[PDB]
Ligand binder design. Structure first.
Ligand SMILES: Cc1ccc(C(=O)Nc2ccc3nc(CN4CCCCC4)[nH]c3c2)cc1I
Length: 142
């Protein structure tokens, strides 16, 4: 059989009225979460957010929900996001290339923004133990 589950990747960003002592101009948050009333913790081991090299501890890990990183900084960047599964067979993780953008190139000028990216994952022939976790999370058998 085939089991599909859904992830939502997203972020929010806020232009600061005044920059931090550090000069940070934006506050931002990036997340991985399930659709409403779906508990992805059943099948997600951890979520690794790979921040820009300039960040201290750029490898940010959440082993439990919420799977998110709140930060402040100077600029947007491309953020690899690994979602590791509670799975003993391949694949044990999926990697997303997440566009963490902090403005719209002043066209138009915004002082905040939100983005959501809905992702479907398809697991062929999961083990009994991993099927239970996927379906327990609200996954659909196909
Ligand atoms: C292309 C590019 C993109 C982002 C940054 C950036 O925001 N870097 C940055 C560098 C150091 C930072 N430190 C923080 C603050 N956190 C607070 C929580 C504890 C660790 C430090 N945010 C930081 C943000 C720099 C470049 I060049």
């Amino acid at each position: 059989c085939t089991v599909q589950v859904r992830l939502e990747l997203g972020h929010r960003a806020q232009l600061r009225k005044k920059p931090t002592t550090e000069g940070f101009t934006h506050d931002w948050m990036v997340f991985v979460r399930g659709p409403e009333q779906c508990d992805i913790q059943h099948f997600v081991e951890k979520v690794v957010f790979w921040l820009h090299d300039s960040f201290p501890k750029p490898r940010r890990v959440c082993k439990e929900p919420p799977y998110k990183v709140e930060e402040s900084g100077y600029a947007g960047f491309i953020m690899p996001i690994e979602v590791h599964f509670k799975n003993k067979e391949e694949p044990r993780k999926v990697c997303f290339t997440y566009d963490l953008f902090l403005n719209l190139e002043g066209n138009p000028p915004v002082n905040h923004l939100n983005h959501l990216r809905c992702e479907k994952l398809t697991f062929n022939n999961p083990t009994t133990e991993f099927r239970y976790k996927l379906l327990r999370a609200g996954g659909v058998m196909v």
